[PDB]
Write a protein that binds this ligand. Structure first.
Ligand SMILES: OC[C@H]1O[C@@H](O)[C@H](O)[C@@H](O)[C@H]1O
Ligand SMILES: OC[C@H]1O[C@](O)(CO)[C@@H](O)[C@@H]1O
Ligand SMILES: OC[C@H]1O[C@](O)(CO)[C@@H](O)[C@@H]1O
Ligand SMILES: OC[C@H]1O[C@](O)(CO)[C@@H](O)[C@@H]1O
Ligand SMILES: OC[C@H]1O[C@](O)(CO)[C@@H](O)[C@@H]1O
Ligand code: NA
Ligand code: NA
Ligand code: NA
Ligand code: NA
Lengths: 989, 989
């Protein structure tokens, strides 16, 4: 007997190493006057759980369809109730045995009917800009071919198949195929026809492909122009016209434009052009720019540039991989509004419409091929497609389609072979093909650290320390002298750094100082631009983002998909506010005497003519003075000192010697730009006259003693515990020391190095920092002033089963009006647990009040959160926010919302108002406890309990980027130590 | 100013290093004719959360009590709604800063009123047999004293305080005190007055203490008798009478009884005696026995003994530390019924009534002092009370009270200083005091491996391998030559071994063989006798046991308190059934020809006269022959061969050469004993004629092919998957390979050694063994016989993200009646993950049937579960049980219920009956899946889903004792390997 299994034919095709069959030559995405009909819209769709059960019932004819239902196209079909999204980071969701596919393989059959007028005859084609991951296509029942390369475009000739009038298009899509083994990016698995489908006419004497070459000679200022045009792979006679430059030339000839204005991310000058043959005309946007590497520097138009980058995935919280155009435009505007100038298309080519937007708004684009075999690493890279000769044609095809589609856009300054694909022969073949095809753009690929087949040295998450050694050209040498000589002559780029997951990222300033200091350093791209949160609702109607595991995944990686500077709806996270400041292209150093400010132009090409420089002096009441000062344009990388009007300094000299006041100088847009309105803030700097130290109240009030209570002015103490039970009428339910916070995503990551690789969160739990207990040692009153007394309460704080502890003494004093509180902390015993030193999250106090807080106001850093190694974007001033807005809406709740650098605070408990002053402290106010915060997996898990949780911290730990990359830097760590700090409290009813 | 805190006086007393004040001389627990009044019953009780808030409102007078309510005494008050139980193993539930106590310290005020008649005047006392942990006692308002030593007795003189008529007793009990630091046993923390309270009259010319000395001369057979009696610490004139021995002697004089019958656990001969003065008489039970160590052997009455022991805690699932007397008697009977002969009072003296029961029923008792400082280990033993001079008086007091109370009982053969208390000067002081006081009993203590201050070498959980080296006297030497010479001359005891947590314990047989082989080995005590489950109910009324964490504990150790041979209600676990067989005191080896059996008397003193030897031959239908055979008494440690009646062997010779049959020889009690009825089984042995190999059915039926289904006789296959969808009408929902089981408690423990210390359960999860997936490679029919065909289904099984897999081929054959299934397993790729070899739990098949199973029957080992390194108690025969009874009711659900050694099985699905035959396999049937079993934390989490989960295993892993002690032994491990095995199936409707 012979075979009896079902569907072996479909599965054999899915297991194919080949690049897909039947498609036209890969070419550029071109704006053409040829008639076109978009087939996007409502299609019919049927889902089958595997190939062996996918019906073979002639559905491709579209007649008598059973089981089909409406579905929009383009779409990621798990976003519409057909199956569910599934998130994995590295691990494959199927057994690793290439090229084989699992039995559980969603098969989607798509069908649409459309009308083809006489414009699409004799010749036309069908274009698919993306199918995840394996498509088969029929038109009127005849097979056109298949598609491989989920984020790449495929075109099929329908001449003689397309019929006048009604036509029926059928597409079978398999989620998984052999191609899934090379599409293992860290993101959601989402099958579907997720990009545009277009019917295009191909008139005779038309234009199939165009290759624009627009160089710039920064010495002469000339533009070097050659525009290739071809039909069916052969060069053709066509006319290229550039009206603005008074140019008419034949395609295929190189000319020298006497003077062009060069293209850059800062000044994205574009010239409108058209290349036309008898039967077709293509409209182009030409940006003249040349890219070169010399003296170990990445240079554009003769100047080293600094990349202020992000890694941009394509994701939408409700449509999956389908990003509507208005979302693309909005988010690119938002990037510019935060001083971003570079984008890495992690880790695949974007929607083809993205390229023209990058050209127009101004971004340096690393365009990356759709290739990642990350899941093979855990097996020592055994069977890695990148080094398997059977995969060469498939991988070269991926690179070719990547290069051909976008080769005409000035914004693309580097080609990238892929991401986390190891090293191998097929990667070298992709580089060789690209170098031969387009030598005008350097090659990028991080996976091969030897850098044998690339033109820049790229790394991800290298420490600040190692980056400094690379910046100096003193990194350790490669074992191969020839390769080392090559790599040392390359400029260095961080294709991913300062992982922006949750609270953070920390340590951005230390990287940036190196970027500004060492020319070899090209800059870096933050990981990543957006969180891939998927919107989920409840019968309550409450909306929250879901992540890995929230969709039934047998195998997932949790919330590592929510690791962005903005949430899935492009709401900024605090890290973006800080990032904007870190990469600001102008440096403003306000003089302490308020006479002027130093201004350095950090841009690479533009001067300062685009900015209006404005100043304001704000005080306790409000603004005292302000205006605008004229600055002679400052050349790029140049420096000057700007005088402020004499009234500003005189105003500084006239203050009371205790009055706080802030002078802020800002650089805003003088006029509307393509990405923001006039007045938009780009850079800023401050100088502060800080408020004098607060006066401790004279201890003139005595301590009144009762059986179970002590009273000292407005404070009533529980005589049993020694802690206050109310201050001026507001109930105090608990007061104690804090040393711990609800772990951030970073605290949950392993900090490599040392024999201790427990995450900091685990070190804390093992140490008991989350379950502190306090023992009362004694209560004592002492002589103060004029019959007054101070009340000292001695305690020891520790945790169950631990011998180490801390002695805490609270000294209370009052004049009847304000309350003086002095806290003294002293280590008792060695703070070591499980053989390693315990580290602290904080040294602070937790006040639990028995009433809710409606409003929180403070003088310090704001408006958003700030921790020791973050908060660059938090400026000095007076701020006020409702309680809900003090919080930060991370998908997985975690420590957040602390306002470091606070000098004074005011909580409003309805009619009463609680004020806190003292030496600089961090402020946090929450309607729920830390234990509720730590336990919560999603924001709906957080509930108010009618209380106010007030945190006053004398010291804080940094947050770092330990979820992926460096942990907290040394200077921001918090090791157990003795400490003392003073506060003052007061209630206004 | 000076102090203002509350309750400093009470707290100062709780923090005291002293042994408690005001009590009478520690003495023996004596049965006296002096009038006594038990004050047990309903008391009044008030709970306060700490000393600083415990009222000082004169409640001791019992007048005008506010906040008091009824509570029984004795009691563990968290067992009655006042607070809650809390379980920790090693870790202290409070900060470790001796002698200080936490602010959260439940304070229980107890009060009772009683009448004192003229019998209690002039002199009387109050006796407290246990208070956890610190008691203060007032009678009619006057303080008698305090108590320390929670499981020790205290007596207070009330002469001149006790008043004629009504009296008021008030007791304040603090849960925590300085004493808690030395009472860190692995058990529930349970405050309360948990043992009897008694008013005793002390007539003039009475007897306060008695010290019985009853030695035995095994050469002459003489008894060496001296009975000390004293009053107020001075020897007194008193008469000792022993009627059975015709003895009248003065107390304080040693005499030589010409002939006594010696006492042993096997023959606990006791002589009734009375010692009397003018005003009081004490009734004693005297067992003549002498204990000695010679030639590195622990000897009683001149013979080396073998300890068949358990560690006995005192626990009740609803009363806490209060064990009712009828429960004590029942559980001690149950121990004897399972061949146990020794008890360790882990880790404190038991209720005083326990000692007379041990004397009467016959146990070798290690009586252990109330001392354990385990929680100091994690800090390098810093501050350990065992070596702190300030604790010497407190610890000597503990030992003194321990020794004095029970010194008169023959069952106590060793004194133990404590448990897991490290090493230190105070332990040496406790040993020195004990040696001087009672030299007739050797000293035990495991904590000091050098054994400097003990008379036996004790260890816990030493591997079988190290035990064998110790048995041979070739263990590694101590650095001190003098101490090494001493320890090598000591016999060796395992005070705890084969940890009996969950499924297990495994490896009991390997220890036992060493015990029988090496005289130096004294035996061992299983950890532990009982699970400390606490009963919990729901509104449903369903009862289940709770463990650590189920009572709100901030700090707990989960289900490690449920680690016993019986559950809290004394229901046997399978481990006890196996243990009974492992330690059976007779060895019965049935001859293969059924002519007779070898019989070895494993006892140390008794012959075989107490046993009736019975035989039976059981066959498929039922019993064929049986009767009783007369055995001449066999001396201890002697051997003989017993002939069986000729009809037995002739019956063996006459069987069909394929018929299964079992000959069982049993040793039962010939007459009622004190611990069981006549006919109770003590030892057994078997000889089996196994059934012939099953015949594979002739493959005469062909394979019928259809579009979506294949049929081969009674099996219908899904043509898409290749798996059967029904066999003879019973629906099959899934069929696949298994390599994993729901981790046992042992699988969750770390196996120390090797660079891999992940628990086996974690190794499995990391390896994906719990989430296997199967890919279909092909289906093929082949020529069988006379037009019949066999159907082969080739598959590959792996898991997501893994490259290793296994190829599984199912060959199906049928003659129309029975179904022949051959399974072939072959490794594909190296089964390595996270750098270490993957191990398998099993090689088997899981059948998921679409109907429920009411009954499971099989021929194999039973009735209870058996795994490769367990099941010693499972004997060969035919068994049948309802589905619920196939399961094992472990508190935390886990893998259990497998019946290894099965030759045939019959599941009844209502009207239809599914039969499985084949070479030996393991059988398991469950109404729920493995994923539900693994997820379940308590038995209510298990739910039936209307299906039958049938597991047929060709190979199984052992279970070991890795939760604490050795993991699975080498010969029971299951490393990935190729395998093949045949089965036959058949349905009877
Ligand atoms: O090496 C550490 C291990 O040592 C063994 O002897 C014993 O099972 C335990 O103490 C365990 O912790
Ligand atoms: O550049 C054009 C290239 O693209 C392909 O057509 C893929 O369809 C190849 O056949 C050709 O080489
Ligand atoms: O014609 C523009 C470009 O496209 C090709 O024709 C092939 O697609 C190339 O030969 C040319 O460089
Ligand atoms: O053996 C009697 C011993 O017991 C104690 O009374 C404890 O109350 C000690 O005072 C005495 O030494
Ligand atoms: O009297 C019996 C035993 O008890 C004591 O009197 C003290 O309690 C000891 O002197 C004696 O050995
Ligand atoms: Na996050
Ligand atoms: Na991620
Ligand atoms: Na258990
Ligand atoms: Na235990």
């Amino acid at each position: 007997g012979r075979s009896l299994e079902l569907g072996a034919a479909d599965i054999q095709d899915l297991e194919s190493f080949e690049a897909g069959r039947g498609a036209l030559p890969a070419r550029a995405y071109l704006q053409s006057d040829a008639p076109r009909l978009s087939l996007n819209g409502e299609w019919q769709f049927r889902l089958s759980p595997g190939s062996r059960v996918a019906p073979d019932d002639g559905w491709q004819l579209g007649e008598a369809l059973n089981g089909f239902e409406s579905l929009p196209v383009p779409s990621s079909w798990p976003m519409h109730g057909h199956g569910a999204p599934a998130y994995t980071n590295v691990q494959f969701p199927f057994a690793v045995e290439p090229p084989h596919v699992p039995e559980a393989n969603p098969i989607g059959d798509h069908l649409v009917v459309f009308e083809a007028g006489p414009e699409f005859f004799p010749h036309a084609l069908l274009r698919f800009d993306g199918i995840e991951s394996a498509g088969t296509v029929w038109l009127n029942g005849v097979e056109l071919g298949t598609t491989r390369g989920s984020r790449l475009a495929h075109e099929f000739d329908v001449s003689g198949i397309l019929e006048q009038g009604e036509n029926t298009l059928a597409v079978r899509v398999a989620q998984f195929s052999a191609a899934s083994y090379v599409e293992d990016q860290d993101m959601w698995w989402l099958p579907g026809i997720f990009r545009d489908v277009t019917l295009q006419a191909r008139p005779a004497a038309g234009i199939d492909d165009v290759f624009v070459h627009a160089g710039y000679d920064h010495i002469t200022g000339e533009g070097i122009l050659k525009v290739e045009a071809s039909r069916g792979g052969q060069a053709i006679d066509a006319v290229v016209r550039v009206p603005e430059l008074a140019l008419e030339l034949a395609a295929g000839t190189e000319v020298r434009v006497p003077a062009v204005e060069p293209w850059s991310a800062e000044v994205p000058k574009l010239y409108e052009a058209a290349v036309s043959a008898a039967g077709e005309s293509v409209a182009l946007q030409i940006g003249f720019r040349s890219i070169a590497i010399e003296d170990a520097q990445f240079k554009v138009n003769g100047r080293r540039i600094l990349l202020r980058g992000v890694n941009r995935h394509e994701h939408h919280p409700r449509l999956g991989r389908v990003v509507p155009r208005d979302v693309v435009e909005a988010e690119l505007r938002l990037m510019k509004q935060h001083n971003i100038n570079a984008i890495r298309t992690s880790h695949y080519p974007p929607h083809p419409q993205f390229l023209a937007l990058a050209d127009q708004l101004g971004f340096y684009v690393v365009l990356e091929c759709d290739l990642e075999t990350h899941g093979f690493e855990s097996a020592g890279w055994a069977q890695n497609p990148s080094d398997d000769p059977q995969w060469e044609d498939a991988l070269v095809d991926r690179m070719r389609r990547t290069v051909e589609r976008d080769k005409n856009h000035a914004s693309v300054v580097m080609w990238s072979l892929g991401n986390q694909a190891g090293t191998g022969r097929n990667l070298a073949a992709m580089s060789r093909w690209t170098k031969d095809r387009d030598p005008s753009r350097p090659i990028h690929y991080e996976g091969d650290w030897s850098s044998e087949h690339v033109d820049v040295y790229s790394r991800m998450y290298a420490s600040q320390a190692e980056t400094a050694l690379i910046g100096q050209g003193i990194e350790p040498a490669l074992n191969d002298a020839a390769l080392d000589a090559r790599r040392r002559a390359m400029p260095f780029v961080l294709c991913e750094y300062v992982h922006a997951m949750g609270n953070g990222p920390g340590g951005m300033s230390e990287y940036q100082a190196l970027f500004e200091k060492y020319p070899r350093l090209m800059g870096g791209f933050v990981w990543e631009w957006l969180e891939h949160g998927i919107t989920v609702s409840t019968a309550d109607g409450v909306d929250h983002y879901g992540y890995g595991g929230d969709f039934g995944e047998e195998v997932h990686d949790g919330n590592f998909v929510t690791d962005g500077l903005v949430d899935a709806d492009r709401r900024p996270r605090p890290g973006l506010l800080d990032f904007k400041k870190v990469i600001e292209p102008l440096r403003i150093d306000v003089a302490r005497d308020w006479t002027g400010f130093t201004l350095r132009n950090g841009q690479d090409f533009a001067d300062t003519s685009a900015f209006s420089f404005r100043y304001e002096v704000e005080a306790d009441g409000g603004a005292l003075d302000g205006g605008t000062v004229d600055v002679a344009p400052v050349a790029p990388q140049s420096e000057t000192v700007v005088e402020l009007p004499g009234s500003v300094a005189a105003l500084a000299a006239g203050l009371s010697d205790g009055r706080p006041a802030v002078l802020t100088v800002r650089a805003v847009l003088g006029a509307d730009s393509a990405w923001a309105d006039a007045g938009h803030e780009v850079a800023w700097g401050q100088s502060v006259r800080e408020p004098g130290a607060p006066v401790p109240p004279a201890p003139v009030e005595p301590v009144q003693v009762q059986d179970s209570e002590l009273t000292l002015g407005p404070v009533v103490f529980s005589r049993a515990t020694g802690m206050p039970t109310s201050i001026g009428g507001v109930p105090v339910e608990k007061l104690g020391l804090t040393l711990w916070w609800a772990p951030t995503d970073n605290d949950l990551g392993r900090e490599w190095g040392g024999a201790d690789e427990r995450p900091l969160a685990t070190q804390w739990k093992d140490a008991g920092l989350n379950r502190l207990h306090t023992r009362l040692l004694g209560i004592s009153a002492n002589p103060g002033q004029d019959g007054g007394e101070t009340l000292t309460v001695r305690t020891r704080v520790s945790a169950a089963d631990k011998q180490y502890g801390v002695l805490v003494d609270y000294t209370w004093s009052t004049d009847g009006e304000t309350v003086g509180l002095r806290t003294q902390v002293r280590r008792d015993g060695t703070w070591v647990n499980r053989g390693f030193e315990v580290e602290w999250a904080r040294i602070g106090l937790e006040f639990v009040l028995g009433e809710e807080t409606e409003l929180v106001s403070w003088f310090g850093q704001g408006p958003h959160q700030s921790y020791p190694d973050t908060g660059q974007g938090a400026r000095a001033g007076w701020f006020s926010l409702p309680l809900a807005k003090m919080d930060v809406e991370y998908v997985r709740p975690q420590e957040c919302g602390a306002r470091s650098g606070s000098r004074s605070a005011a909580l409003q408990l309805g009619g009463r108002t609680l004020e806190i002053c003292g030496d600089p402290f961090a402020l946090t106010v929450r309607p729920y406890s830390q234990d509720v915060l730590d336990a919560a997996a999603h924001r709906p898990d957080l509930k108010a309990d009618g209380r106010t949780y007030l945190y006053v911290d004398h010291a804080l730990r940094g947050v770092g980027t330990a979820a992926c990359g460096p942990g907290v830097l040394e200077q921001y760590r918090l090791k157990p130590r003795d400490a003392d700090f003073i506060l003052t409290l007061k209630v206004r009813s």
